[PDB]
Amino acid sequence: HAADRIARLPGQPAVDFDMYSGYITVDEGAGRSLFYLLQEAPEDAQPAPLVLWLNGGPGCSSVAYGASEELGAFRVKPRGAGLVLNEYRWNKVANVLFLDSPAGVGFSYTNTSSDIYTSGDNRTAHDSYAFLAKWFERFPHYKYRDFYIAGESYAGHYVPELSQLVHRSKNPVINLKGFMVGNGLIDDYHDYVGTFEFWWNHGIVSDDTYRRLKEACLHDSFIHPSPACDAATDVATAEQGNIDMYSLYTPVCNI
Amino acid sequence: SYDPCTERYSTAYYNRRDVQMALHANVTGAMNYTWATCSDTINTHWHDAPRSMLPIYRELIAAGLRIWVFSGDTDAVVPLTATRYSIGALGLPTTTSWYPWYDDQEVGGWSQVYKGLTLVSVRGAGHEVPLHRPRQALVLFQYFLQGKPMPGQ
């Protein structure tokens, strides 16, 4: 635990809260270990809840996004020169635990190379569950803490999937109070539907492409679209042009 | 002030030797690959992924857990409408109909409270909410933690 404590990161401003980061083995046999980043609330806010935050992709890192350009305590300066404090960091009110998952993402790693070709929601979650159980044994002062799980995008899968294991696990140490999902996959069919409608209502595709997408993709999943679905989305892509689809009214990075 | 190049900086930073040192990451240098924001490989070799999360939602709602769903309304990747429709599928009853919530004097987005779930949109925010509307993102987070509805007025 103390060994995971971070002293100061390069370029880091001085702050009034602690952080920890390190590895937890989630699969001895495979040699799978997950890297985490814990950013605690200042004393004045303790004992604050514990919040597990997960980014999506699938294959995107909680540290890279969550911690580094979103709710995390700092933001990286250009050229990766140093840090700035995030004035609206969520660790102002909670102990935020960022998990790079699954193995292979971020700093998380696997000793079995094929692991990275076999990832799926199931293992992802089971490993996450493992991670937690173990994590708490390493930070036993967090047992019983009100705990929440939150994420965005593909984590619309990860969050409720993990939540369900935790819930069902009947792990007494984990006081799971709920979860929150942002811009997340919830139901492929409905999501596909709302997606296309939204795009058409934002003037990003033609009428014909709107129609082609509805007809091509509706029985598919986001993660595994049919070839009709992909052909259709290739057209939409062409219609969308050079905009940031993750933020329609903001500019694309030029470097 | 908004800078769309954040992922580049991050990548520069995490790939620094000293930063990993400080992080206790890649202790032994055996991760012989550059650190990246996502793994294209895993991204491209994904396996199982159920089509609907709704059943879990039903389960946990029944289990009494607190569940909040949010959406940055200028994201087009997993847009608000996709969310409205998915949640709509749960068929829950409405306790508090779609209303504007305010941050200070400005409308931060809207929200609707159902029996068992709270839905919140964050006005003008893209996919990465706390990136595009950091101030509002925090309000959202504080209310959720408190289990309280987004504030009107």
Partner: peptide, 4 residues
């Protein structure tokens, strides 16, 4: 490489 599609990121949600």
């Amino acid at each position: 490489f599609x990121l949600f």
